[PDB]
Design a protein around this ligand. Structure first.
Ligand SMILES: NC(=O)C1=CN([C@@H]2O[C@H](COP(=O)(O)OP(=O)(O)OC[C@H]3O[C@@H](n4cnc5c(N)ncnc54)[C@H](OP(=O)(O)O)[C@@H]3O)[C@@H](O)[C@H]2O)C=CC1
Ligand code: SF4
Ligand code: SF4
Ligand SMILES: [Zn+2]
Lengths: 178, 299, 71, 328, 122, 103, 111, 382
């Protein structure tokens, strides 16, 4: 792939794949710098941040994995630059390069908790207003912690008490022999 | 190798009945999970499968020998580990039928583990007749308290009740086998349970008072009794903690009359070899000669 | 019955257990039967081959129908 | 009771209550307490099925089962109290209606529910709710009836708690919401008797919290007539002073001598006469509420207060009166 | 007729050329006006309860023919309804008083409210 | 905001910055949600300080950065009418447990 | 990282058990071993009295088993110690592959 | 000056909760508020098998249902390497394209009802109630037809569905013409749409529009011509691409894309090979009812595919199709297990509704509903 020859070797730091869509699992420090490359470059012109997929691996040490997808409307190719930032590592924000990253990074911080550096208006986009907790993590239970909301003598108001529901039935379908 | 595996998993699923929906071990099945992983996706056998009557093997092992693949695992388990030698591979050919030739309930304990031994639904727990499925059951790696061997266990519970008690590997106490006292004691935990603190009224029948009232009446009656008259008989199922709390309670009450239910008068609990199995339960594998002094260890 | 007294509180329509215990056992020829279901092998249960070596009728587990050897 | 849960809204509390007055201002807080601590409530309603609709919520899928019943017809009260172990009674009126008279709505019902609960052996706790100072020889026929109700619910059914809530304040109440919407007569508040009345209001949430607290209590609070007074013994004028703090209005009271009021409330007291037309529920000027307003006996004596329920009432300033903001 | 107070008048403005294909047990007259025009409006039902009618009064024998799922009039599927377990329709009595409405087995309105406690108390 | 917290010193500096921000914003808090009568400024300062002190034993700088960010989020959603007010008024031994449950 | 994680206070004093789920004794296949799971005990499950189904109150009812499975005791312990849970790791009991052969079935009992 | 511009007409744009910072009538910034429709879809899918995961996709975009099941299926075949037949591909496109028509028929005339034209809404919704006679006939549910399964497609067309889709396609050029004669020529339409929400191509690229809002600006970019993901490389159709970018170009495209979709429907009808409906790999496709009942090895797979699942191998792919809203892509990380692992759903309307901030700057407050119109903002995907 042409993109790996020109790219500074240090920027594609950790990993690199070659199927199911190619990816440059880079380091969080060289990320927005790597996103600056592949865009505003004559032979690699992405210009289009398709998606920013937070992925949570609890068993890693760098829990999350902020998977930046990238389409190249010019050369008709799609590259998936990734990162790895745990719960308390502010990662560089690429809203300055692709302004679509604004809401995607708001969602990545909301769902997961990967705060974004110098991202203007980094505010919970999806979850409730007084939401405490980050849903799309793994350790966040499906039904939520305190997320039932019912009406009450505090009229015109829906409270936010601790939650109780028919227990979500987790089925252990997974079979041995893989 | 893969073609050999697919070949054999076609033969096994050839005369095998389509009992997977009505099979008790439908989810937890070696045959289903080997067919869905190593066996072929399709079966060419379109003829009359062989079928086998269901042998009566007692009030524990529900038997559907049509599902059974005649791998002989149980007829080996009953001959070797269980050591009772009742099961047999009667007949030859496809007509092979596993079970006692004469109607003979598996009088041996330790013969409920044949269901975990069985790689197929055929031999299944009749108490756990159909009550649950391999996926509903939330499993806890609990232990057992019926007998003092302290065998390891998986209390497969669905919600608030214990559906099935299944063993789990612990090579140092019970390899993969648990006594029929432990497999099928789960039914106890839901019958005749005491659920409310009942004190005795002025008549003779109980009254399900709350906890404050029952604890108050018990406390008053210990305050108005001579100390050396308090005794603290502790149950055979009581854990270490509650026995420690019972000791520390009936002690500071001015008594020393706490004791477990089974230990008779004047036990020598000073040196710990005097009430232990010093040789590990695994250590008995290296023993040359045993002298079971009474002890009836089968029971 | 008692099992059927857990889900059915009507107790006026005959309990399915009785509706199947009152249908006569079906005579057959060989030692193995099909009981593919009602009639249409695609609208019945997976075909369950039953053994008729015993003298008493051997029920089909899925449908409750009963088959006897009819020698 | 046979409680199997953690908090409420899906827990169980072994309290399958039948709050007879649930479709009412006190009822919506009591039902919410009983069905937010996780217990069934068999809310019986009298007429329009829209009455207990605001109670199908605040209870999780059958924790609140609104039922239909006729007040004068038994064999229906027995059907509402078929599957029940707690029976609270909030059925009361402050105004005589052409069909149900003061006794037939305050006393001859509470006695009837008492008897038909006695017969239905199994009602562990039967709470009886009547106004504070409802003792015989009280001027207001509502309080004499509510006193006879206490005397007949204790006689016909001993160990039956009797709350004595004083005028209860809160949203959709009958004490503050009539004064506002009469301040909408250009700040003109007609405090009757000159505000010399001394009555102890109480946040309705705390009256409910007491009615449930006598259920969760032990064998005590049985046959013991509490007096759910509240804090800050007020006077009608002083209580009105707090309304004008919430609703932005300038205090423009007037004094009304009791003869002037009883003459102004002389109409709407022909209820039994004007048969072909029901009168529009006298809100502020009620000859019987005025007879009660005369003597300031609405003060908690040495009888059991909230303190005997491990409970302390909220104040009447701030949130427990913030339902008035909707009038600004 | 005599109902100028309903859309039943729209149905009775139909039937002018329509043919009557069968009538079920409840009295619902099932009509068909094909050929003329307006596909989707060539099969209907006149509920024989000109007031207090509602949907779901159409039995299962006809609820196929009337939604155009099949082409078998209820007079043809009545030879296929199972005799042993066959049950008449119930009009969906939703709200029309208890003991007509349906109830779960713990609703406290259902006669015989079952207790779910899996443990059998002592 | 970049995590200049390469040390506990910068993190503590911006903790004091956020504390000054919340304190100097308490006026609008009391105004928009009407607590100037139920709660005193001393009490709201007390609560903010008890928050910042309840989580004072954080030897990790980035965790303090994230805590200050959650606090700024809470404040900014309290300043504006994003969250309601009935929680702001709320935001401001063994035997007695045994008698209630088994846990 | 317990306080920043938004988890309520009452669920960070929880006592967990970091086990490795033993092999399902019924099926002799090791394809589900070596996946260490935190076990929030989460025992409190009553029966919602309207219908026959159960009804938990603990938020951590299922996530202990479902979707939260690490790959090593070190990662699972690091997880349960970041969030401030009181983890008691229960080691997995592994099997001895004792030497065994076919020709031992046909052993000769001398005489 | 802040204005809480909410859902003008509910039931059309459901939870639209913009917070417009205006300047008289000129809007200075539009701040959309998301989450009012944020169901836990990107979390709930981590908890269910790859089969149970599919019904969420028809519920992701509620006006173009099967396009998202087709984007998910192509993300659990990208991993599974599950080659589907030719008939499955042709049906899958004949319904992805019927869905493009079902969406443009809504997203044009719901937009045209927000602008004010009341009748195109009801004509297009009679057309949509004709196409739901195909959805409801081929799968069962008129809207959420959980029909495009991972391997192939759920079950074959009924024996009279291509004849009816033909009898519909013959009469559908006229319906598009009416929707066009009623709106395209109008001076009250052009005036309401020309030079409204103009997006220079650099902006449509920057903000990741990638839809009918990336072909307004003139960027010739259709992921059916760029990344042909079915018979699309065989089917002939021209992607209409705008020249100005204003909301009148995006309308003209959506009204031509509704004709090229008619071409694709007519082709898929005229060339639909009589082949198997699902992939022959019976460990990814549950066997038919007839086979699983008669064959023991099929019954085992029907049991381990409707309880266990596929267990698609460990990988992570971003499969993006051209859904009607835009490039709907589902980034599907897959742990080896039978349940997905962070099935992230890139949904246009999350990138488009970002564009509302700069699209509707200096446009009058009454234009802020036209912008929301031409973005085809469906909040299920946001
Ligand atoms: N409101 C106050 O300020 C004070 C009230 N109390 C007492 O508290 C209790 C409840 O108060 P609140 O809810 O405000 O009272 P309401 O006058 O609003 O009535 C409450 C309930 O009583 C029912 N009810 C009243 N009369 C009859 C009747 N004749 N037949 C059937 N049902 C009847 C009502 O049914 P429906 O809604 O259908 O009419 C409603 O369910 C009463 O005993 C009341 O006297 C105590 C202190 C003062
Ligand atoms: S053992 Fe039972 S579940 Fe397994 S393949 Fe045989 S019939 Fe099916
Ligand atoms: S263990 Fe089960 S499958 Fe194997 S021979 Fe015995 S009965 Fe048959
Ligand atoms: Zn059968």
């Amino acid at each position: 792939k042409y993109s790996w020859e020109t790219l500074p070797k240090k920027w594609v730091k950790k990993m690199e794949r070659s199927e199911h869509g190619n990816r440059f699992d880079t380091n969080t420090d060289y990320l927005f710098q790597l996103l600056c490359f592949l865009k505003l470059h004559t032979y690699t012109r992405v210009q289009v941040l398709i998606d920013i997929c937070g992925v949570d691996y609890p068993s890693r040490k760098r829990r999350f994995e902020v998977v930046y997808n990238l389409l190249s409307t010019r050369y008709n190719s799609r590259i998936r630059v990734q990162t790895s930032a745990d719960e308390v590592t502010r990662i560089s924000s690429v809203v300055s390069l692709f302004p679509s990253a604004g809401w995607w990074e708001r969602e990545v911080w909301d769902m997961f908790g990967v705060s974004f550096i110098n991202h203007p208006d980094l505010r919970r986009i999806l979850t409730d207003y007084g939401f405490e907790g980050h849903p799309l993590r793994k350790d966040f239970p499906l039904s939520g912690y305190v997320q039932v909301r019912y009406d009450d003598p505090e009229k015109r108001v829906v409270s936010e008490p601790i939650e109780m529901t028919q227990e979500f039935r987790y089925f252990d379908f997974a079979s041995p022999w893989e | 190798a893969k073609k050999a595996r697919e070949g054999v998993m076609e033969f096994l699923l050839m005369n095998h009945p389509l009992d997977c929906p009505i099979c008790d071990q439908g989810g937890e099945c070696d045959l289903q999970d080997q067919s869905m992983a190593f066996g072929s996706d399709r079966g060419r056998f379109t003829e009359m499968k062989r079928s086998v009557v269901d042998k009566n093997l007692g009030p524990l092992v529900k038997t559907v020998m049509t599902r059974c693949i005649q791998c002989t695992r149980c007829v080996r388990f009953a001959s070797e580990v269980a050591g009772v030698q009742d099961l047999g591979i009667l007949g030859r050919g496809s007509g092979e039928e596993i079970g006692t030739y004469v109607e003979k309930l598996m009088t041996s304990e330790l013969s409920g583990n044949v269901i975990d031994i069985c790689p197929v639904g055929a031999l299944t727990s009749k108490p756990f007749a159909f009550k649950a499925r391999n996926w509903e059951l939330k499993a806890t790696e609990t232990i057992d308290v019926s007998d003092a061997v302290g065998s390891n266990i998986r209390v497969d519970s669905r919600g608030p009740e214990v559906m099935r008690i299944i063993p789990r590997l612990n090579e140092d106490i019970n390899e993969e086998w648990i006594s029929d006292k432990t497999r099928f004691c789960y039914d106890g935990l839901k019958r005749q349970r005491l659920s409310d603190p009942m004190i005795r009224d002025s008549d003779g029948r109980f009254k399900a008072v709350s906890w404050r009232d029952a604890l108050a009446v018990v406390g008053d009656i210990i305050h108005q009794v001579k100390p050396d008259e308090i005794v603290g008989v502790a149950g055979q199922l009581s854990d270490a903690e509650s026995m420690m709390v019972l000791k520390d309670f009936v002690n500071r009450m001015g008594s020393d009359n706490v004791w477990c239910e089974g230990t008779a008068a004047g036990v020598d609990a000073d040196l710990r070899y005097s009430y232990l199995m010093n040789t590990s339960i695994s250590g008995l594998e290296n023993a040359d000669l045993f002298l079971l002094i009474g002890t009836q260890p089968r029971v | 019955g008692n099992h059927t007294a857990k889900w059915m509180q009507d107790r006026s329509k005959k309990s399915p257990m009785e509706l199947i215990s009152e249908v006569p056992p079906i005579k057959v020829d060989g030692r193995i039967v099909a009981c593919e279901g009602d009639t249409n092998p695609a609208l019945g249960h997976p075909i369950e081959f039953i053994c008729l070596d015993l003298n008493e009728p051997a029920i089909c587990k899925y449908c409750g129908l009963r088959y006897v050897q009819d020698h | 009771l046979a409680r199997k849960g953690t908090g409420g809204r899906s827990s169980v509390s072994g309290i399958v209550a039948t709050v007879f007055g649930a479709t009412g201002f006190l009822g919506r807080y009591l039902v919410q307490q009983l069905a937010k601590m996780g217990s069934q409530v068999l809310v019986p309603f009298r007429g329009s099925e829209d009455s207990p609709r605001h109670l199908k919520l605040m209870g999780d899928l059958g924790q609140v089962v609104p039922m239909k019943f006729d007040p004068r017809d038994e064999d229906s009260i027995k059907a509402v109290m078929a599957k029940a172990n707690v029976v609270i009674n909030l059925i009361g009126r402050e105004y005589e209606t052409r069909n149900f008279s003061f006794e037939d709505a305050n006393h001859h019902i509470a006695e009837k529910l008492a008897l038909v609960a006695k017969e239905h052996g199994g009602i562990m706790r039967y709470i009886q709710v009547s106004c504070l100072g409802a003792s015989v020889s009280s001027p207001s026929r509502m309080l004499r009836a509510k006193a006879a109700a206490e005397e007949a619910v204790l006689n016909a059914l001993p160990e039956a708690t009797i709350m004595r809530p004083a005028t209860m304040i809160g949203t959709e109440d009958r004490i503050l919401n009539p004064w506002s919407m009469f301040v909408k007569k250009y700040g003109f508040l007609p405090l009757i008797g000159g505000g010399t009345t001394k009555f102890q209001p109480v946040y309705v949430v705390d009256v409910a919290a007491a009615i449930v607290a006598a259920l969760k209590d032990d064998g005590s609070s049985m046959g013991k007539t509490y007096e759910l007074g509240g804090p800050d013994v007020f006077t009608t004028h002083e209580l009105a002073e707090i309304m004008y703090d919430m609703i932005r209005e300038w205090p423009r009271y007037v004094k009304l001598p009791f003869p002037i009021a009883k003459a102004m409330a002389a109409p709407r007291d022909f209820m039994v006469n004007k048969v072909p037309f029901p009168l529009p529920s006298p809100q502020i000027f009620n000859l019987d509420q005025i007879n009660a307003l005369t003597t300031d006996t609405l003060v908690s004596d040495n009888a059991l207060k909230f303190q005997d329920l491990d409970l302390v009432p909220h104040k009447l300033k701030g949130y427990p009166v913030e339902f008035l903001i909707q009038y600004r | 007729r005599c109902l100028p107070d309903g859309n039943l008048l729209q149905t009775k403005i139909h039937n002018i050329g329509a043919t009557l294909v069968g009538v079920d047990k409840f009295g619902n007259k099932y009509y068909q006006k094909l050929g003329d025009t307006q596909y989707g409006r060539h099969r209907w039902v006149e509920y024989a309860s000109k007031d207090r009618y509602n949907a779901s009064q159409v039995p299962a024998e006809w609820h196929g023919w009337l939604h155009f799922i099949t082409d078998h009039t209820g007079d043809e599927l009545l030879s296929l309804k199972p005799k042993r377990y066959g049950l008449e329709h119930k009009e969906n009595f939703s709200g029309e008083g208890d003991a007509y409405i349906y109830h779960s087995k713990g609703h406290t309105l259902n006669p015989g409210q079952k207790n779910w406690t899996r443990y059998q108390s002592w | 905001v970049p995590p200049n917290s390469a040390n506990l010193t910068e993190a503590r500096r911006r903790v004091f910055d956020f504390f000054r921000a919340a304190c100097r914003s308490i006026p609008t808090i009391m105004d928009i949600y009407n607590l100037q009568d139920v709660v005193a400024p001393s009490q709201l300062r007390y609560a903010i300080s008890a928050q910042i002190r309840n989580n004072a034993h954080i030897t990790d700088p980035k965790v303090i950065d994230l805590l200050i960010f959650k606090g700024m989020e809470e404040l900014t959603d309290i300043v504006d009418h994003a969250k309601q007010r009935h929680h702001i008024i709320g935001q401001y031994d063994f035997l007695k447990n045994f008698y209630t449950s088994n846990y | 990282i317990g306080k920043v994680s938004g988890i309520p206070e009452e669920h960070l004093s929880r006592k967990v058990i970091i086990y490795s789920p033993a092999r399902t004794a019924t099926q002799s296949g090791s394809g589900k071993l070596g996946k260490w799971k935190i076990n929030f005990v989460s025992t409190l499950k009553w029966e919602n009295p309207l219908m026959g189904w159960t009804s938990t109150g603990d938020p951590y009812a299922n996530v202990g088993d479902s979707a939260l499975a690490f790959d090593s005791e070190e990662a699972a312990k690091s997880f349960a110690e970041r969030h401030g849970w009181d983890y008691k790791v229960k080691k997995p009991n592994t099997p001895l592959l004792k030497v065994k052969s076919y020709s031992d079935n046909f052993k000769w009992k001398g005489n | 000056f802040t204005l809480n511009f909410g859902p003008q007409h509910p039931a059309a744009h459901g939870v639209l909760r913009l917070v417009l910072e205006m300047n008289g009538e000129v809007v200075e910034r539009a701040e959309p508020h998301i989450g009012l429709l944020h169901r836990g879809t990107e979390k709930l899918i981590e908890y269910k098998t790859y089969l149970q995961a599919l019904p969420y996709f028809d519920r992701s975009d509620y006006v173009s249902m099967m396009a998202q099941e087709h984007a998910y299926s192509l993300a659990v075949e990208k991993l599974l390497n599950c080659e589907v037949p030719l008939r499955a591909q042709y049906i899958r496109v004949l319904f992805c394209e019927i869905t493009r028509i079902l969406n443009h028929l809504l997203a044009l005339t719901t937009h045209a009802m927000d602008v004010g034209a009341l009748t195109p809404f009801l004509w297009a919704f009679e057309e949509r109630e004709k196409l739901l006679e195909f959805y409801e006939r081929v799968s069962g549910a008129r809207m959420h037809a959980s029909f495009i399964r991972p391997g192939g497609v759920a079950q074959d067309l009924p024996l009279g569905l291509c004849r009816d889709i033909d009898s519909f396609t013959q009469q559908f050029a006229s319906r598009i013409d009416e929707l066009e004669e009623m709106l395209t020529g109008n001076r009250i339409w052009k005036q309401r749409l020309v030079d409204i929400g103009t997006v220079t191509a650099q902006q449509a690229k920057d903000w990741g529009f990638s839809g009918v809002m990336l072909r307004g600006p003139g960027v010739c970019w259709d992921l059916r011509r760029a990344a042909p993901y079915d018979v699309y490389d065989q089917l002939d159709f021209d992607v209409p691409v705008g020249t100005r970018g204003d909301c009148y170009d995006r309308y003209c495209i959506r009204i031509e894309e509704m004709r090229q979709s008619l071409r694709i429907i007519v082709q898929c009808l005229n060339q639909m090979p009589s082949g198997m409906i699902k992939a022959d790999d019976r460990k990814l496709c549950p066997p038919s009812r007839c086979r699983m009942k008669l064959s023991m090895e099929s019954s085992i797979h029907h049991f381990e595919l409707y309880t266990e699942g596929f267990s698609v191998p460990a990988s992570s792919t971003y499969t993006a199709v051209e859904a009607p809203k835009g490039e709907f892509g589902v980034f599907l990380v897959s742990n080896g297990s039978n349940r997905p692992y962070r099935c992230k759903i890139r949904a246009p309307g999350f990138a488009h509704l970002q564009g509302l901030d700069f699209m509707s700057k200096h446009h009058m407050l009454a234009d802020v509903v036209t912008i929301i119109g031409t973005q085809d903002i469906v909040f299920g995907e946001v």
